[PDB]
Amino acid sequence: STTLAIVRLDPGLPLPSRAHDGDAGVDLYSAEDVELAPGRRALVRTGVAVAVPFGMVGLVHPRSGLATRVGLSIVNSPGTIDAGYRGEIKVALINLDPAAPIVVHRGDRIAQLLVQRVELVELVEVSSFDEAG
Amino acid sequence: TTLAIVRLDPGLPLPSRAHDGDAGVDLYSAEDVELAPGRRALVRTGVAVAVPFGMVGLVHPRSGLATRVGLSIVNSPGTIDAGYRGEIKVALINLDPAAPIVVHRGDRIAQLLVQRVELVELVEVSSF
Amino acid sequence: TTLAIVRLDPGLPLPSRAHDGDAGVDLYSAEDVELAPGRRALVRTGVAVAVPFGMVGLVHPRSGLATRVGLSIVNSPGTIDAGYRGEIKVALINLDPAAPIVVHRGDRIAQLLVQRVELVELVEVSSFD
Amino acid sequence: HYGTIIKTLRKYMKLTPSYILHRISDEFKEKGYSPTLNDFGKFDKMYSYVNKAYYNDGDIYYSSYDLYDETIKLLELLKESKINVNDIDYDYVLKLYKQIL
Amino acid sequence: PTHYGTIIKTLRKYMKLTQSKLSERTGFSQNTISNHENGNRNIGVNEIEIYGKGLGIPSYILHRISDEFKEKGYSPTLNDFGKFDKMYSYVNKAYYNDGDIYYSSYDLYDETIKLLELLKESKINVNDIDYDYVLKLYKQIL
Amino acid sequence: THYGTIIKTLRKYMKLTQSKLSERTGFSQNTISNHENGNRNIGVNEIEIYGKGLGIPSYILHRISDEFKEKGYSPTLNDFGKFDKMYSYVNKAYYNDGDIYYSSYDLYDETIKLLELLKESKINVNDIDYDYVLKLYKQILST
């Protein structure tokens, strides 16, 4: 019962759909055509921008299909999308296969986006962990 | 709250929380696989879980193997969707430049977490 | 809403949230380490945290260094258990094919998140019904 | 083919996934028509099979790219072998699925 | 060949637990505990999780001990379990209070056996030993 | 440990009185006047408190004290009016531009770097527009 405001910077790309209810997160589409050589990386644009609610965080997870088959992953693998960030969501993909180049077409769903409530804790410095062990 | 498990392979122990408070149970390997430097493989864990609705199963690498032998997961924050009832598999990858990794049956390769995810509804707007 | 942290290195600043709403505080490095292409090292953060019971500490790479020079974490969703009271360390790895990475003392290596994890009780069944 | 997008779907259920709806519109701008819209009865039965296999088989969940695209290739493989959607078994669909995967 | 019945009684007597006292902790009736200990009824895979929480031993240790029976016929760990608990209490303190151990450990059971095998080599007893000395030995294993 | 000067200098910048800050930080005015003068060394937890009080992130105060141990003085604290106008621009760029958010290291360091570029080209921070500084931000982040 929570609404995540999203602006489509690329109207040619479909809105991210959640499909079956209960799925972890919506998948994000690629707006660029990039080819990743074995070992290289690139910052792919998704063409969409979201407004993560306060006290939550947007998380960009790789997709098990592409990761297992061609070996495509994300460098900052638990990608953080801060609540205050309003710019274009980008995905930093990387070709982990030793000698097989990866080709990404426009519109392909490269990664999925999860939103979890993070506990904004307040750090307190202590001499030692007394009252703990 | 509990969580159902089905041991597709009874030869491996049930995943155990061990010390209370730890993030998640560690998952055992059902296969004997050797990862060449750079290569990867999809190891089966011999268990199947029914993540509750509105939550998500997360497969994290173990800091022990990652620091020492350099073993990590390709889709490193491994997602287990709430509706997934199949056998959980882990996509390991030997990130060590030139050291082979050998995984035996029963070796604990990764750990499993369960967290409450906010199932949100996307709403498009003209401009924030 | 309260987390205790001991500075095992008085030189590095205490991690801070800076602007509120950010996912997690960033950790400073206590060592000067250089990662050769493909190599990895366990850099010390010089701090130790007391994760509250029912939560988990999460160490995420910093997107910046990752997109630019290609610095990531081997156990990329690094778990800091609630019962762990030792010095937090980060398992860095150089993913750039042929460019060495140099980390200086005080450099912000990674950020630390604290989320509520559900401590579930596993119960085995013959087959879902 | 925006008008044809919603009205026809009502007739399937005799009523008086948004990503799937956008994919059909991609066929109108590409091939001029929608081969999926006219034979939706065979697609829904196959998409309901492809849905069950992604959520109950590890080899599918950990090796799939696009559920819609996999349903189309499977229907083209069954039309090539001249096999009907009514006389098809879910177990038989799984064997063809793993091959394409 | 599930020797868990022998393992529970041996550990139950180690913990100075009464069959009735263990009965209140696990919820199992005395007879249910008795038939399990006697092998007349096999101990289920979910039941072991409860005897683990009743004896106070992580269930993973019980699987490692039963793995010793299927291998060597007996359990060398179960026979000298007093020395193991004293050594495992050290590896546990080091795993949760030392960065060098927490970020470089595989299996606490296996390393606890290795630490006891190293002390038997130097002919020092596991009770006249200090936590600091085992930690230095622990770091050497990693 | 010259934090005492750092508080009083920034306290005047925020137009906060010693009593009005006492209401936000909960320290007696005598404890404040002892810290702002250097009779009692402000502790580690105090720096976090004051930081929240004066509306300045905690790590910026640690960066200002690092300049005293280095150059003898703090160039950032002296020209703090130019810093606040400059730090407000890098914040908007870091949270509203993908080319910044996904390729930035330290907002503080980049905030000082941009101030040094304008000092070289003799451009003022008050008569400069965000659009031009965003263009320069992309430069120091490329290459």
TrEMBL record, chain A:
Transmembrane segments: none annotated. One of its GO terms (biological process) is dUMP biosynthetic process. Its EC number is 3.6.1.23. Its cofactor is Mg(2+). The keyword Protein biosynthesis does not apply. It catalyses: dUTP + H2O = dUMP + diphosphate + H(+). Pathway: Pyrimidine metabolism; dUMP biosynthesis; dUMP from dCTP (dUTP route): step 2/2. It holds the Pfam family dUTPase. Substrate binds at R63, S64, G65, N76, T80, I81, D82. CDD domains: trimeric_dUTPase. GO terms for molecular function: dUTP diphosphatase activity; magnesium ion binding. Keywords: Hydrolase, Magnesium, Metal-binding, Nucleotide metabolism. Residues 14-133 form the dUTPase-like domain. Homotrimer. PANTHER family: DEOXYURIDINE 5'-TRIPHOSPHATE NUCLEOTIDOHYDROLASE. Belongs to the dUTPase family. This enzyme is involved in nucleotide metabolism: it produces dUMP, the immediate precursor of thymidine nucleotides and it decreases the intracellular concentration of dUTP so that uracil cannot be incorporated into DNA. This is Deoxyuridine 5'-triphosphate nucleotidohydrolase.
From TrEMBL, chain B:
Its cofactor is Mg(2+). Pathway: Pyrimidine metabolism; dUMP biosynthesis; dUMP from dCTP (dUTP route): step 2/2. The lineage of its organism: Bacteria, Bacillati, Actinomycetota, Actinomycetes, Mycobacteriales. Homotrimer. Keywords: Hydrolase, Magnesium, Metal-binding, Nucleotide metabolism. This enzyme is involved in nucleotide metabolism: it produces dUMP, the immediate precursor of thymidine nucleotides and it decreases the intracellular concentration of dUTP so that uracil cannot be incorporated into DNA. This is Deoxyuridine 5'-triphosphate nucleotidohydrolase. Substrate binds at R62, S63, G64, N75, T79, I80, D81. Its EC number is 3.6.1.23. The gene is dut. One of its GO terms (biological process) is dUTP catabolic process. Belongs to the dUTPase family. It comes from the Bacteria. Signal peptide: none annotated. It catalyses: dUTP + H2O = dUMP + diphosphate + H(+). The chain holds residues 3 to 130 of 154 of the full protein. It comes from Mycobacterium tuberculosis. GO terms for molecular function: dUTP diphosphatase activity; magnesium ion binding. Residues 13-128 form the dUTPase-like domain.
UniProtKB/TrEMBL annotation, chain E:
It comes from the Bacteria. One of its GO terms (molecular function) is DNA binding. Residues 8-61 form the HTH cro/C1-type domain. This is Orf20. The chain holds residues 11 to 152 of 267 of the full protein.
